[PDB]
């Protein structure tokens, strides 16, 4: 059932609609409903090429912003990632754009929410299991954005970033213990 | 109570101990994190992110340094002495106690309990099989006395003999052979019903477990094991059985008039590797340890 | 006198790799009970000595500030004081040097 | 110039099958162009060669040689990178498998001997190579006993044939 003060909800919808209108004004013949499938498949195959370690394809699939965010902390480790099931069809939750004049470039950013399950198991440089589990399709709720360069004549739809609200459940623990040292004092006194 | 060979008794005791340990490891489904703080004096402010009921204060010492592992004899989990291989349970604060600390009384008591347990393990497996050898308990004598003690009741046929110097040296040799193999002092906290069902045979051990589970509202008694020997003891123990450097058995004494049967008290003195004494001082301690010590009231 | 022949690598290895020329392992090393910074037996801990030396240097700088110039050496005893820490009745005739600090929990 | 010790940490192993030995971690580290003689560095490396990380640091802290502090620094960075990069949980659970010194690029200077004669001085440099393996140090090989001596003598006697005949 709808909640009170739906005028602001409709105003947010209208802001997303005017962003979509600008995107359509720049480029026509762009349906809205088929996007979530495209984003889902792009996400799945980008993570597949991450598992296979194919940077020449991961570059075409994801943007330069999230290329290092996704490839740097995993350089010398082995990943076993696999999409198993789509729980519910993804929903486009936000469509915004900016009229940035610094280089005559306008970028369209669309956030789409997906709820699904996957199997992640990060191994070590020596082949030892580090973080994940092999065959336990744990459920994850993720909001990922996609950015396109409208002014560019080619402009592949690539994933830009992933947003995480603070209320999100904590991810699974680490299989190894960690020591966090206190202050490393020179000849002095400790106050705590 | 029925007929059972001592060998099969030890096998079944070990199987029950291992089954209980397995279920204790299993009732926790996943790895949980504990933030164990270091309230010691040398490395203050150090927090370890350890695993619940898996990791140990020895593992915390492994994180810190090798000197911690070598010298730390006991842990202090927010108020209390913990043996070095007891898995941690809650987010706590820890402090490591060595033999040369300002107040080493807790580690002295733990070391003497461990030495008494080793002496009992040596005694139980050094007599003829057709005699019934039973361990009564290890009295909590203070370190200020001359030696640690173990009470043992022998079969009726041995109510008139006395072991000689050669037999005493054989006991010391068995103790040194036990020392030579690095055996961790494994610990376990079990329920009263399980504690009774492990032993099930000795009425002395049964009453010991009753006395040790009465004062605890949760009816839990501590259990410790070296190799395949299992004893019931009060208080924690030292991590390894090779911590002892000088070990001996001095003499055995009788206390008859308090019971129709006979209860013998084996006595022995030991000194750790960190506190080894000279030959002459050790001879003095050996000569003193042969005296009967009566501290039970 | 000149060498009649070149020394071989085998002879050289035998000379310069025998136990007399190797570094010996020392077993004087244990942990400092305070500060736990790996001192050596029969030798003061470097960490604790550096702490004491830093405090002594600060005290001596205050002494030089108070004394004025050279050739002073007051003919009375001396006592170091800290924040708060009102002077005691026994140290009346003594010179007082109070720089500014909380008294360290090793200097009493 | 060759820098191959640096690239030994870039090796990536395939994931182990569940039922397999732990495959202890293996960390390579080095310092290049140390203003020290390589023989003088070899003595310290030889001392450090078999020890665990903590014992080696303890031994190097109370050696009054120029290279002792350099090797101590190298070992400290190796330990830090072993815990941080190569997934070693216990910072004290490392031992030294390889510890050696190598010649570096040197310079040549004139010495001005006591006539119109002279010598060429060499400004010595060296490298230090260390390798840490995760796990307790391996036990030292005990000296062979008289039982082993007699056993090998008997086997030598039993192995002999009738030579230069059928
Ligand atoms: Zn110190």
Residue A178: inside a domain: no
Q: Where are the alpha helices (DSSP H) in chain D?
A: 38-48, 53-61, 66-84, 146-158
Residue A112 lies in a domain: yes
Q: Judge whether A187 lies within some domain.
A: no
The Cα–Cα gap between A163 and A110 comes to: 12
Give B70 Cα–ligand 1 centroid separation in angstroms. Answer: 19
Q: Tell how far CA D162 is from the center of its chain.
A: 46
Q: How many residues are given for chain A? A: 192
* Residues of chain D contacting C28 with CB distance shorter than 8 Å: 62
The CATH number covering residue A52 comes to 3.10.450.240
- Cα A18-A20-A21 angle, rounded to 5 deg: 60
Helix (H, G, I), strand (E, B) or coil at A26: helix
Q: Choose the closest CB to C35 out of B42, B67, B71.
A: B42
List chain C residues with CB under 8 Å of B43: 36
First to last CA, chain A: 52
SS3 B62: helix
> What homologous superfamily does CATH list for D1-166?
Ribosomal protein L22/L17 (3.90.470.10)
Q: Is the dihedral of CA A67, A69, A75, A77 positive or negative?
A: negative
Measured distance CA(B98)–CA(B238) in Å, rounded: 10
Alpha carbons D65 and A48: distance in angstroms, whole number: 54
Please, are residues B96 and B83 in contact by the beta-carbon 8 Å criterion?
Answer: no
**What technique was this entry resolved by?**
cryo-EM
- Exposure string over B102-128, b if 16+ CB within 10 A, otherwise e: eebebbbbbbbbbbbbbbbbbbbeeee
CA gap B54, B85 in Å, rounded: 10
Distances (CA, A) of D109 to A42, D32, D36, D40, D77: 65, 21, 16, 21, 34
Q: Residues B111, B73: contact at Cβ < 8 Å?
A: yes
Distance A179 CA to ligand 1 centre (A): 23
Neighbours of D, requiring at least 3 CB pairs below 8 Å, are A, B, C
Instruction: List the single residue in C31, C34, C37 with the smallest CB-CB distance to B71.
Output: C31
Buried (b) or exposed (e) across B145-165, using 16+ Cβ within 10 A? bbbbbbbbbbeeebeeeebee
Q: How far is B214 from chain D (nearest CA, A)?
A: 41
The domain ranges of chain C are 27-108
Specified resolution (Å):
2.6
Using CA coordinates, name the residue in chain B closest to C35. B42
Which residues in chain D have Cβ-Cβ distances shorter than 8 Å to A125?
Answer: 11-13, 25, 86-87
Distance B110 CA to ligand 1 centre (A): 28
Task: Provide the domain count of chain A.
Answer: 1
Taking contacts as CB-CB distances below 8 angstroms, the residues of chain C near B42 are 31-32, 34-37
Report yes or no: B178 and B190 within 8 Å, Cβ to Cβ.
Answer: no
Give the structural domain span for A107.
Answer: 1-163
D41: nearest Cα among D120, D124, D107? D124
Task: State the pairing for strand pair A78-98/A107-123.
Answer: antiparallel
- Check CB contact under 8 Å for B46 and A181: yes
The answer to whether the beta carbons of residues D58 and C38 sit under 8 Å apart is yes
């Amino acid at each position: 059932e709808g909640l009170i003060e739906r005028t602001e909800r409709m105003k947010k919808t209208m802001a997303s609609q005017v962003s979509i209108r600008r995107i359509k004004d720049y480029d026509a013949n762009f349906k809205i409903k088929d996007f979530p499938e495209k984003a889902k498949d792009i996400f799945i195959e980008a993570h597949l090429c991450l598992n296979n370690s194919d940077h020449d394809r991961l570059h075409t699939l994801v943007t330069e912003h999230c290329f290092p965010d996704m490839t740097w902390d995993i350089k010398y480790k082995t990943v076993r990632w696999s999409f198993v099931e789509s729980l519910e069809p993804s929903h486009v939750v936000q469509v915004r754009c900016s009229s940035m004049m610094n280089q005559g470039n306008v970028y369209g950013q669309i956030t789409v929410r997906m709820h699904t399950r996957q199997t992640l198991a990060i191994y070590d440089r020596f082949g030892r299991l580090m973080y994940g589990q092999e065959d336990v399709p744990k459920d994850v709720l993720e909001y990922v954005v996609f950015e396109k360069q409208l002014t560019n004549p080619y402009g592949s739809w690539r994933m830009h970033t992933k947003i995480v609200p603070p209320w999100a459940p904590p991810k699974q623990p680490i299989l190894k213990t960690v020591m966090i040292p206190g202050p490393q004092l020179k000849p002095e006194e400790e106050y705590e | 109570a029925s007929q059972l060979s001592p060998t099969e008794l030890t096998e079944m005791r070990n199987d029950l101990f291992n089954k209980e340990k397995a279920r204790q490891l299993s009732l926790t489904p996943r790895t949980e994190k504990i933030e164990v703080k270091h309230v010691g004096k040398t490395d203050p402010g150090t927090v370890f992110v350890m695993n619940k009921n898996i990791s140990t204060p020895y593992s915390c010492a492994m994180h810190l340094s090798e000197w911690y592992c070598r010298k730390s004899i006991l842990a202090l989990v927010d108020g209390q002495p913990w043996d070095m291989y007891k898995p941690l349970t809650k987010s706590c604060e820890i402090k490591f106690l060595t033999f040369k600390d300002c107040d080493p009384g807790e580690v002295n008591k733990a070391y003497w309990r461990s030495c008494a347990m080793m002496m009992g393990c040596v005694i139980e497996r050094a007599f003829k099989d057709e005699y019934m050898v039973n361990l009564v308990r290890a009295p909590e004598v203070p370190v200020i006395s001359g030696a640690f003690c173990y009470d043992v009741v022998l079969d009726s046929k041995l109510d008139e003999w006395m072991p000689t110097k050669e037999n005493l040296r054989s006991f010391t040799k068995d103790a040194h052979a036990l020392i030579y193999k690095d055996l961790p002092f494994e610990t376990l906290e079990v329920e009263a019903k399980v504690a009774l069902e492990i032993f099930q045979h000795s009425k002395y051990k049964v009453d010991f477990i009753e006395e040790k589970a009465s004062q605890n509202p949760e009816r839990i008694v501590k259990l410790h094991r070296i190799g395949d020997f299992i004893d019931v003891s009060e208080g924690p123990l030292i991590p390894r059985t090779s911590i002892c450097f000088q070990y001996e058995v001095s003499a055995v004494h009788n206390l008859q008039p308090t019971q129709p049967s006979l209860i013998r008290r084996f006595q022995g003195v030991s000194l750790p590797v960190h506190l080894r004494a000279h030959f002459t001082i050790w001879d003095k301690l050996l000569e003193r340890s042969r005296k009967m010590v009566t501290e039970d009231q | 006198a000149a060498p009649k022949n070149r020394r071989t690598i085998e002879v050289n290895r035998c000379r310069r790799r025998n136990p007399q020329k190797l570094i010996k392992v020392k077993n004087n090393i244990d942990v400092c009970p305070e500060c736990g910074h790996l001192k050596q037996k029969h030798v003061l801990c470097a960490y604790c000595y550096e702490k004491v030396c830093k405090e002594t240097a600060e005290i001596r700088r205050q002494i030089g500030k108070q004394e004025g110039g050279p050739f002073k050496a007051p003919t009375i005893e001396t006592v170091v004081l800290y924040t708060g820490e009102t002077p005691s009745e026994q140290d009346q005739g003594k010179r007082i040097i109070e720089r500014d600090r909380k008294r360290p929990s090793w200097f009493t | 110039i060759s820098r191959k010790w640096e690239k030994k940490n870039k090796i990536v192993y395939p994931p182990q099958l569940p039922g397999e030995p732990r495959r202890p971690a293996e960390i390579y580290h080095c310092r290049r162009q140390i203003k020290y003689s390589k023989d003088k560095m070899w003595y310290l490396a030889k001392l450090i060669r078999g020890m665990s990380i903590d014992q080696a640091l303890a031994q190097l802290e109370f050696n009054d040689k120029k290279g002792a502090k350099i090797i101590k620094e190298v070992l400290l960075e190796a330990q830090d990178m072993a815990v941080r990069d190569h997934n070693v949980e216990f910072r004290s659970n490392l031992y030294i498998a390889e510890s050696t010194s190598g010649r570096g690029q040197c310079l040549k200077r004139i010495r001005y001997h006591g006539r119109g004669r002279f010598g060429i001085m060499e400004k010595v440099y060296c490298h230090y190579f260390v390798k840490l393996v995760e796990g307790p140090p391996p036990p030292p090989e005990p000296p062979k006993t008289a039982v082993a001596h007699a056993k090998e003598y008997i086997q030598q006697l039993r192995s002999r044939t009738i030579v230069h005949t059928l």
